[PDB]
Paper text:
To ascertain that similar conformational changes in the BII-CII loop occur in other [name]-Pros in response to rupintrivir binding, we first determined the crystal structures of apo [name].4-Pro Sydney (2012 [name].4 variant) and [name].3-Pro to 2.4 Å and 2.6 Å, respectively, followed by their crystal structures in complex with rupintrivir to 2.5 Å and 2.71 Å resolution. In all [name]-Pros, H115 is mutated to a glycine residue. As observed in the available crystal structures of [name].4-Pro, this H115G mutation results in the loss of this hydrogen bond, causing the BII-CII loop to adopt a closed conformation. This conformational change in the [name]-Pro causes the sidechain of the conserved arginine-112 (R112) to orient closer to the active site. The closed conformation of the BII-CII loop and the R112 sidechain conformation, as observed in the structures of [name].4-Pro, narrow the S2, S3, and S4 pockets in the apo protease. By contrast, the [name]-Pro apo structure shows severe clashes with the P2, P3, and P4 groups of the modeled rupintrivir molecule. Isoleucine-109 and methionine-107 clash with rupintrivir’s P3 and P4 groups, respectively, while the P2 of rupintrivir primarily clashes with the R112 sidechain. In addition, the fluorine atom of the P2 sidechain causes steric clash with valine-114. Thus, loop opening is essential to accommodate the P2, P3, and P4 groups of rupintrivir.
Residue numbers in the entry:
A (entry chain B), B (entry chain C): -1 to 172
C (entry chain D): 3 to 123, 130 to 172
D (entry chain A): 3 to 125, 130 to 181
Amino acid sequence: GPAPPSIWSRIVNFGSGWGFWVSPSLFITSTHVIPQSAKEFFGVPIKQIQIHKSGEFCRLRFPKPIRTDVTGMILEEGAPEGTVATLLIKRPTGELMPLAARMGTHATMKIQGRTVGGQMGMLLTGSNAKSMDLGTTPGDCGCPYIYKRGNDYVVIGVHTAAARGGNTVICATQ
Amino acid sequence: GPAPPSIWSRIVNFGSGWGFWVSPSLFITSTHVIPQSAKEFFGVPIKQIQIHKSGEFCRLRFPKPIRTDVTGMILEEGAPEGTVATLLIKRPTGELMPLAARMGTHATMKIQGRTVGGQMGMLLTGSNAKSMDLGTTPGDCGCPYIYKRGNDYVVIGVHTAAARGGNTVICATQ
Amino acid sequence: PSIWSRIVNFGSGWGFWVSPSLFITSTHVIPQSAKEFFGVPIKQIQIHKSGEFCRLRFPKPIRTDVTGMILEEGAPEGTVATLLIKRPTGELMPLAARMGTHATMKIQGRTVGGQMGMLLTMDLGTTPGDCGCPYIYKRGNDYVVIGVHTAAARGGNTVICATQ
Amino acid sequence: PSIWSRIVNFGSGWGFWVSPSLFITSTHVIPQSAKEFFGVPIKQIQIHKSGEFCRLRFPKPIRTDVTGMILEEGAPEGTVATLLIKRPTGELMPLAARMGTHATMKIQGRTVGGQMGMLLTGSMDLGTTPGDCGCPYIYKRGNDYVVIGVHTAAARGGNTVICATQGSEGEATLE
């Protein structure tokens, strides 16, 4: 098992994609996945939420605990070079997909014509970054990148882009 | 103000579509949007959940309340013929779309190659049923049909099918 | 893009981007204490008012993401159009409205002219804040805009869509 | 039509529907108390055991939903195939494995044969488990996935793996 169920339960639908409950009050997602026409997130009006955007990484701090079931989790500003992280994808079908990804340097690139920055990852699934069965889909944005630092699990960011050419994905960081 | 924010909050993403919290433990949705591969619905394993499927209408009663923020609501089998209900669509962008729908007879259709049943509904939008901006999309299935009987709101079913070429829609009931 | 993105908050109500340079709205929704619309001095905006139908032709294209829509002066009598109401709650509300003859009526102590419509639609009624929202129907494959919401008779059944 | 749906539990492990009527799995995963497989008596099933590879051709199509797929005896050396692991947790884990020479591996006093490979994850827990035996190895040729065998064993370190194929290929005897 690459990810305990206590970590899969933290991944929940948000807007056009997903997001991750780092802590009962902290929630990370991709900026372009945010539902920009919504007036509330998880029952809290927007004005009450501390929204901090670092590129396409988005951090939401809620005034009161939203997910009491989760515990506080370590958040690293990207993984160390060469770390084999796991992109924990949830699909609308209910499928869980731990996609192994070798994390590389931080870079910026044009993906859809937009310029996306973040830590580069090279999917270790045998397919290109864009594959319904073996890779990512546009709807997977917001899903977390996790690795194991000693005995602890560490979120290094969230899925923000998948290059069409090969196995390159972008993990939005900090 | 067609529906108060307390009613829109009950509408939440579920699988390939949406669902509606009638009470803290009651959750209705469309059968064909259920995440079939998911072992857990809202953190609760599907084995502890009471699932009752009537046609393409699905009811789920959970062991312990999850949405303790919403009060119990009246759920009845369809609406009196001629009633002007509102299909309360949520979109991944966060937009809210209350589409007026004059409810008609209970009947069955051939939709997408499958046989579907429920209370028919003529959209009073002035546009087609499968319009992208002014009508329903396949991803709206599970959203509620709600009308107001006197001073009480009454949910009558969930959107399960939209006919091509006209304002006809299907509200799965029971 | 979505047609709703063409409906933007404007003054005390709304307005509709027909083309990247043409913006239709209701006059009684226009702000008074403002000499700039969407970032252009008024005197450099071509502003034409026909009763309560105001149109603003801008010097350069403000909304380059939108196509050019067909703006006709009302719909043929009996046509079922859609009033696209956007609400501050985030609610997008298409209301069916059968359009009829031209009408001049005293509503809210004010003589309003336009094309009359009859809404075919708990509270799915018009509010004062809706004024400026567009009336639109589909002719063949072409979405036609026929005017903007300018008035609503008491009872929420009869409405006036400013035109011309 | 997802390829993961072709992977289903079988005995103590998994197996893969190559076609509506063809099923492949690992030999040691098969239940020894076998009176029927997928509702078909064994006498009616055409069974081919090549070492740790087991092919079951059923008299009539069982999985009418799946389309015919190409089964090859291994992949070309250097091919980055994909081991499609299914877990009872619901996790679908595609693991990249660089495929190499055909080989036998010493394990449990015996020998297991197949095309060997090395997982691209190297040496957190993204490795195989014995319960994964029977899961398919695949690789994309052209625009079609090709199954090359099923997982049967991993070396002690868990990086070297054995993809059991239809069988070992020998040297031709000419004339």
